[PDB]
Symmetry: C3
Subunit: 275 residues, 3 copies
């Protein structure tokens, strides 16, 4: 599968909800909040109207990286684009294809691995909302982009992955030969280095070299900081086979404290060597 | 408007290091007009710049540049006695070169890029005091044919300040929708940071602009940088997003909460900014 | 210039983990000759390496490698029982592949790049103690046609040391003007760093040099890196700048002040260095 040319106007509902233990999450339905929030995927040219309701007892917002939006959808208290308790606001995100401007230069398209998060809970930069769990991934695809069999989102939020307790993953499963897409977001206060055992990717927009002429470094380890995002696709077990392949932050105190998960790659019969 | 010409010119400028109010120190092109950041120096690949440097201060100081060609006598360090004693003068010479094929068949990278200069001698033998006090500034070297901007703004994350300004006090920059704005970004000190701009994005490559449809550089609005990293880009003000008070800030959460924030004020051609109401 | 040939060879080498003077631990290819950093392993894309590994120590130890192809039985972790007990032996196998077209129409990336190996079992299940003690080394995988250097030097920022050495004790590296010098740069431990080289610059891409005039990679002399990052490049020693004691250092100000500094000693043909103290 490859991505089609975009151009459709889409609508979705989103809600901010309290979860257990002082956490907060986004969901596409009341009672369906999750951390991270739901994956939003768009084709370059698509417009998305996000009909957003704050079900909580404190103000909240939705702010997005990378996409086109007018100042009225900035999602900050500074611009009065936040949402009071019980309120509804329609946020509009737009995207565009690349193309040459009249001045002769190449205008970059929206395609990329992006993310949305809160900007008003706790402080006017969303520090409390982000810690509590108000973040989620946005994928914008260019026409012809290769589509994966599955997508997994890994968020290094301070000293946790996806706000989970230390040493509790998350784990992800695949079968040898699956095309697996990873979205990588970082939040909070610390720099991290994401590492994957047994797999590697290109350090460019799609995480895959375009061909023999792409000079991007091929890596299996990458430093990132708060609100960085990137993504890539790998063929699970390619050249290396089945197994319980760790991924972790490579800052030594961070892995030692439990910023680790498993990429569980099964043989076609469902078994996993040595696990 | 237009594009950078071919280089090759021999240029001179005078540069002064001066004390400023409040324990600051700055470079400038004239006495009593020092600034933090210091003056933007622009060269075209091939140009030579002779910097007639004068220390007006009562302590040693130096001038050390990233990226450009210099011989060891313009290194600007005490370690090889290229610093400037109090009250003294020295000529620092910087050269630039074009890219080109070597005799061995390999491709020699050119000098073009976003670079910077700073002190290497005040407080420690790595300029830790000078850098903290404000002795830093931007250097742009352009390749022949590089697109030229309508304006250029330099943003330096120096420890917990922007351009040595106190928390929450700017700087702010203004533009009109459609302006071609160049941003030069430099980091200094002890901390890593992540630079973010609302409403705008750039390419992670030499010029910040994709060269065309075959450039696979990631397009970003957020980038981690550490001490003495430099990069630059050009954006079209309000492109696809309209006028507004577009924030820029470090995205390390405690850093933005403690004032590492500024405003990119993008106006309509009639001067209006929608919903800007501070 | 000289160029890497096509790979495809199957090679074998012995490796040992040994305790070294002063509470350190190192890898080596011969008993009693372990070093920090460990020996440089060089492969052409397609080659296979069987490392016949022996642990001469009193604690379990492993060998884990970045970037290369390996099965789970050569992962080098306790978590899947591919560590080596005291006195034990194990054959670890590393494979590499060329780039090429896939049936789905995508371009599979090759193994070529600047990589590294290290312990994953000493002190903790992530090798924190082993890495601190010095169990790390560089791996270079070359693509057919890659330019070969006159010499290669490995610089490891391991916590607050370079190559586990005390502050202000190097290492220093020697070259003659015109030498083609390869640098492998690895980071380990707990802290981010920014590697900086006076007088020289390189391209932020796979090989550290631009393929030609269509490569838009930023040209840099300063780069932020974190634990287990690796990159490398090649430079012409003194090119456009001449002979001298060219410092390299972390540019985090407190780190360079504390001694994360070394010298790139570039000599004239007669072996002297204008302005230096041997
Ligand atoms: Cl302005
Ligand atoms: Cl690939
Ligand atoms: Cu913001
Ligand atoms: Cu981490
Ligand atoms: Cu690994
Ligand atoms: Cu953000
Ligand atoms: Cu220096
Ligand atoms: Cu910051
Ligand atoms: Cu934003
Ligand atoms: Cu510097
Ligand atoms: Cu690991
Ligand atoms: Cu450092
Ligand atoms: Cu320097
Ligand atoms: Cu590692
Ligand atoms: Na690149």
């Amino acid at each position: 599968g490859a991505a089609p040319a975009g151009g459709e106007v889409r609508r979705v509902t989103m809600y901010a909800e309290r979860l257990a233990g002082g956490q907060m999450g986004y969901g596409l339905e009341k009672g369906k909040a999750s951390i991270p929030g739901p994956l939003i995927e768009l084709n370059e040219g698509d417009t998305l109207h996000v009909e957003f309701e704050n079900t909580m007892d404190v103000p909240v917002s939705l702010h997005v990286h990378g996409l086109d939006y007018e100042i009225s959808s900035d999602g900050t208290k500074q611009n009065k684009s936040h949402v009071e308790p019980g309120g509804t606001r329609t946020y509009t995100w737009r995207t565009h294809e690349p193309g040459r401007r009249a001045d002769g230069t190449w205008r970059a398209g929206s395609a990329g691995y992006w993310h949305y998060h809160d900007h008003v809970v706790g402080t006017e930069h969303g520090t409390g909302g982000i810690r509590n769990g108000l973040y989620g991934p946005v994928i914008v695809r260019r026409k012809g982009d290769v589509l994966p069999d599955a997508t997994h989102t890994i968020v290094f939020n301070d000293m946790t992955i996806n706000n989970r307790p230390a040493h509790t993953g998350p784990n992800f499963e695949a079968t040898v030969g699956d095309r697996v897409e990873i979205v990588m977001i970082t939040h909070g206060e610390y720099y991290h280095t994401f590492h994957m055992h047994g797999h590697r990717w290109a350090d460019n927009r799609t995480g895959m070299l375009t061909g023999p002429d792409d000079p991007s470094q091929v890596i299996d380890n990458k430093i990132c900081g708060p609100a960085d995002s990137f993504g890539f696709q790998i063929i699970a077990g390619e050249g290396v086979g089945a197994g319980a392949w760790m991924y972790h932050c490579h800052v030594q105190s961070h892995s030692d404290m439990g910023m680790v998960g498993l990429f569980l790659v099964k043989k076609p019969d469902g078994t996993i060597p040595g696990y």
